[PDB]
Amino acid sequence: SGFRKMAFPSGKVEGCMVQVTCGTTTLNGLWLDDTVYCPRHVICTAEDMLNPNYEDLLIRKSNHSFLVQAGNVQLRVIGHSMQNCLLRLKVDTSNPKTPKYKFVRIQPGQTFSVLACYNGSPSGVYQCAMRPNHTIKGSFLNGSCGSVGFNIDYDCVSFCYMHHMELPTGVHAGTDLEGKFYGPFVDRQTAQAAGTDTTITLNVLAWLYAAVINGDRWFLNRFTTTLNDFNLVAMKYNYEPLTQDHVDILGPLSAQTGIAVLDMCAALKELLQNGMNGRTILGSTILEDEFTPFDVVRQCSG
Amino acid sequence: SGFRKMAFPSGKVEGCMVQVTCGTTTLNGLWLDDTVYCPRHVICLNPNYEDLLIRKSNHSFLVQAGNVQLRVIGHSMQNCLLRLKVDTSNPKTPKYKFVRIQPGQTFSVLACYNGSPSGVYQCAMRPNHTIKGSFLNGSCGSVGFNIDYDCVSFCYMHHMELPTGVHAGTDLEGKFYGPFVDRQTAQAAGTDTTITLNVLAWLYAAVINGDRWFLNRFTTTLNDFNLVAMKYNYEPLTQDHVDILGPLSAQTGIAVLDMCAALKELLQNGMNGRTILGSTILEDEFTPFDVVRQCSGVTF
Numbered sequence: 001s002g003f004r005k006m007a008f009p010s011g012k013v014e015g016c017m018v019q020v021t022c023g024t025t026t027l028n029g030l031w032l033d034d035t036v037y038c039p040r041h042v043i044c045t046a047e048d049m050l051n052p053n054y055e056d057l058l059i060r061k062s063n064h065s066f067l068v069q070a071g072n073v074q075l076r077v078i079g080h081s082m083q084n085c086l087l088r089l090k091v092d093t094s095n096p097k098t099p100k101y102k103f104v105r106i107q108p109g110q111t112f113s114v115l116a117c118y119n120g121s122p123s124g125v126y127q128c129a130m131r132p133n134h135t136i137k138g139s140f141l142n143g144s145c146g147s148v149g150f151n152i153d154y155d156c157v158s159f160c161y162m163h164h165m166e167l168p169t170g171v172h173a174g175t176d177l178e179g180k181f182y183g184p185f186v187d188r189q190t191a192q193a194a195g196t197d198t199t200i201t202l203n204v205l206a207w208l209y210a211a212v213i214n215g216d217r218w219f220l221n222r223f224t225t226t227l228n229d230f231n232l233v234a235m236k237y238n239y240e241p242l243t244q245d246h247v248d249i250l251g252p253l254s255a256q257t258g259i260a261v262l263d264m265c266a267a268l269k270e271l272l273q274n275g276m277n278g279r280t281i282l283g284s285t286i287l288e289d290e291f292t293p294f295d296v297v298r299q300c301s302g
Numbered sequence: 303s304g305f306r307k308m309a310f311p312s313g314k315v316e317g318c319m320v321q322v323t324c325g326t327t328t329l330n331g332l333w334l335d336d337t338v339y340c341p342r343h344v345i346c347l348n349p350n351y352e353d354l355l356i357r358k359s360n361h362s363f364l365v366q367a368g369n370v371q372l373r374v375i376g377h378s379m380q381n382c383l384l385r386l387k388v389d390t391s392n393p394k395t396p397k398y399k400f401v402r403i404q405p406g407q408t409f410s411v412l413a414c415y416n417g418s419p420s421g422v423y424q425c426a427m428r429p430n431h432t433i434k435g436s437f438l439n440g441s442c443g444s445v446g447f448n449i450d451y452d453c454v455s456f457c458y459m460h461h462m463e464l465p466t467g468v469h470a471g472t473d474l475e476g477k478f479y480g481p482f483v484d485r486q487t488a489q490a491a492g493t494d495t496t497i498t499l500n501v502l503a504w505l506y507a508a509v510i511n512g513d514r515w516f517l518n519r520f521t522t523t524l525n526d527f528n529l530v531a532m533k534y535n536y537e538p539l540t541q542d543h544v545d546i547l548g549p550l551s552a553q554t555g556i557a558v559l560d561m562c563a564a565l566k567e568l569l570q571n572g573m574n575g576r577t578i579l580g581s582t583i584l585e586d587e588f589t590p591f592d593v594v595r596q597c598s599g600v601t602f
Contacts, residue, residue, distance in 0.1 A: 001467030002436035006421035009412060011313025115311060121601035124308030125422055137580070139304035141599045170303035214467070283434070285583055299421070301438050 003210055003282045005290065006299060007113035007127040008152040013159075015097030018075065019120030020089070020146070021067040028117045028146030029068065029089070030162070030177075032098050036068050036075070036089040037177060038146045039164050040082055041187045049189050058082055069120060070095075084179030085164065085187050100156040103177035108132045109200040109240070111292050112149040112160050116140060129290040130161075131171075132240055133197040134183025138163070138172035149174075167194050198240040200289040202249065205242075205264055206296045207288050209253040211281045213300045219281060220259065223266040230265040237272045249293050256302070305507060305579040307587065309410035310449045311602060312422040317394030320372065321417025322386070322443065323364040330414040330443030331365065331386065332459070332474075334395050338365055338372070338386040339474060340443045341461045342379055347486050355379055366417060367392075381476030382461065382484050397453040400474035405429045406497040406537070408589050409446040409457050413437060426587040427458075428468070429537050430494040431480025435460070435469040445474075449602050464491050495537040496586050499546060502539075502561055503590040506550035508579045510597050515576060517556065520563045527562040534569045546590055 020029040020038045023045065029038035041049065043057050063077040066089055079090035106112060111129045115122055116139060128136050128149075140147070140163060149161030163174045164187055171194050173185040185192055208219065231241050242265065250261045268287075276285060291299075322331040322340045331340035344363075345354050358377065363386055365372040376387030403409060405427050413421045413436065425433050425446075437444065437460060446458030461471040461484055468491050470482040482489055508514065528538050544558045551558050565584075573582065588596075 001463055002434060002469065004423040004425070004434075004436040005307070006413065006423045006436060007309060009312045009316050009419040009422050011311075011316040011419075014311050014313040116308065118599050118601050122311035122313075123599060123601045124596070125311055126306045126308045128306075137304060137306075139306035139308060139596070141303075143599070166303055172304070299436060 001214055001301075003214060003299065005127050007125045008150065010113065010115045010122065010125040012099040012152065012155075012157050013115050013148060013150055014122050015099070016095060017115070017117050017120050017122060019069045021069075022061070022065060026119060027143065028120055030146070030148055030159070031068075031070065031075070031091070031095045032101060034091055034094045036077075036091055037086050037162065038089070039162065039175075039187065040085055040087045040179070041145070041164065042087065052188055054082060058087075071120075082179075085175045085181060086162070086177070086179030102156060102158045104158045104160050105176040105178070105180070106130055106160040108134055108182075109202060109292070110160075111290060111295055112151050114138060114149045114161070114163075115147060116144055117147045118143045127290070129200060129203070129292075130182065131194075131197050132200065133195045134181075134185075135167065135171040135173055135194045135197070136161070140166065140172055148177075167192065169194050198238055199287070201234055201239045201242045201268075202246040202293065203289040203291055204239070204287050205246075205250055205261070205268060206253065206293040207282065207291050208264055208267060209250070209257060209259075209293075210291065210296045210300055212257045212259060213253075213296075214282065216281065218279065219271055219276075220263075220267050221270050223270070224260065224262050225266045225269060227262070227265070230262070230269055233269045233272060239272075253293060253296060303511075305511060305596065307424045308596065309422045309424045310447065312410065312412045312419065314394075314396040314449065314454050315412050315445065315447055316419045317396070318392060319412070319414050319417050319419055320365055320367045322384075323366075324358070324362055328416060328440065330417055330441070330445075332443070332445055332456070333365075333367060333372070333388070333392045334398060336388055336391045338374075338388055339459065340384050340386070341459065341472075341484065342382050342384050342476070343442065343461065343484050344384065349485055351379060355384075379476075382472050382478060383459065383474075383476035399453060399455045401448075401455045401457050402473040402475070402477070403427055403457040405431060406499055406589070408500075408587060408592055409448050411435060411446045411458070411460075412444060413441060414444045415440045424587065426497060426500065426589075427479060428494050429497060430492045431482070432464060432468040432470055432491045432494070433458070437463060437469055446471075451602060464489065466491050495535050496584070498531060498536045498539050498565075498586075499543045500586045500589055501536070501584050502543075502547055502558065502565060503550060503593045504579070504585045504588045505561055505565060506547070506554055506556070506590075507588060507593040507597065509554050509556065510593070511579060513578055516564050516568055516578065517560075518564055518567060521557065521559045522563045522566060524559065524562075527559070527566060530566045531569060536569070550590055550593060
């Protein structure tokens with residue numbers, strides 16, 4: 001019983017974190033086998049970040065311009081290259097703590113754990129969702145760039161995020177481990193802003209299922225809805241349009257609880273229309289949208 | 303920017319988790335140096351632990367660390383824990399301490415099943431000596447901890463779920479938090495309160511982060527604050543708590559009793575549609591130490 005915003009254990013990713021310094025800029029890197037990955041903006045001067053040309057700035061560097069350290073120990077760089085918005089630094093030794101891993105690009109509305117680091121050392125782990133607008137509502141101070149987001153399946157780490165930038169609203173933007181940004185963001189100082197965001201409807205439904213599994217049914221009702229009629233209501237409350245694919249994803253939780261997907265959508269419609277009337281669900285006074293169906297199934301009893 | 307509940311990085315603890323099996327019961331154990339600690343109920347209405355343990359041989363305990371079976375060479379009971387001696391000292395043993403935490407204090411929990419870590423979350427010891435954990439069957443022996451620099455201070459080992467679905471367990475000496483016992487009884491969580499000390503810490507966090515609309519021009523006496531806050535089911539604030547908030551009060555230049563006046567007004571008037579650190583609610587699971595640690599960017 002209970003239901004907590006739970007992160008994946010961070011040990012497999014802790015053993016991959018290093019520090020990368022170029023000039024007077026330090027941030028975090030990820031050391032897998034003989035390669036260190038970090039944000040390419042590490043090469044940028046006080047100025048350069050206004051209109052950087054990364055090809056022109058990089059060709060001006062050698063291997064020995066980069067100081068990579070694991071703890072207090074320097075790792076010599078024997079090669080480098082840029083891949084989109086990441087630098088890939090080859091070092092002269094391998095990381096024996098490299099876990100089994102994949103690089104994956106996640107979809108908006110999916111969750112992952114972030115290991116926040118400063119100067120190559122971990123400070124904390126937390127769980128978040130990639131917003132529909134491709135930002136994350138993170139907790140990051142100056143020096144956190146290069147910190148990574150990941151999920152773990154058995155003993156395989158799927159890295160999905162590397163932190164690059166804070167936007168004017170104090171939300172966060174970053175890239176996958178191929179260096180491609182999530183969202184329309186760029187690694188320079190511009191006027192760029194987070195786009196419109198929506199509530200992740202599929203996650204809110206999953207979480208209402210969590211609440212039923214855990215014993216609570218106060219918010220249920222005698223009604224059903226069509227998908228169309230549900231969307232006609234939810235979209236007025238800034239919720240992401242619900243599709244049949246999303247309905248099908250909720251099948252397992254529906255079967256576990258005996259509550260048809262559309263009947264749970266009818267409960268959600270009523271909660272949106274009437275509010276929560278001072279009541280809580282899974283201890284919350286608000287509808288939570290940062291747990292996916294898979295997160296609920298992983299955490300709750302069968 | 304951002305304020306998130308964050309757990310400590312869990313790697314130093316992950317390297318200590320093992321599975322302990324007695325007959326048909328499997329739970330988790332904590333392997334430090336050549337000792338594995340686990341709940342004594344692994345050997346189980348009215349248990350006679352001392353008498354039950356008599357019937358147990360070293361060979362009865364199957365201890366597995368990843369794929370490696372650890373040979374048990376001694377066993378004894380210490381309060382509500384078993385201490386199993388094994389023939390291998392854990393190569394991953396971190397610097398560590400065992401500590402008994404106080405109500406209201408926080409720690410990270412690494413939820414484990416079959417000796418395999420599954421997730422990590424932050425939680426508080428409630429004033430009623432329970433924790434609002436997330437635990438399924440097989441969780442027992444999962445541990446709570448804090449870290450200072452390189453040193454893991456273990457503070458909780460999980461033993462039981464109570465009828466409201468909250469959780470009870472022991473320190474790493476095997477003594478229960480609260481009046482709970484490791485038997486089937488009618489035991490229940492008592493009434494709980496909101497951890498005032500932590501709500502104040504979190505309001506200081508909000509101010510440090512530039513969210514300060516709730517501050518005002520007034521102050522309160524402690525007694526007047528307690529008269530109001532106790533009506534809202536808040537824990538009574540003591541002079542000792544006022545002093546624990548000294549470093550946050552100094553950093554912000556906002557006297558604790560002036561923050562209390564701000565907190566009184568929020569309890570009496572509500573938030574009026576506004577948010578504090580993005581929350582519509584007053585958060586009570588961040589201690590004064592959690593706030594300094596997060597706002598000062600400390601690493602381990």
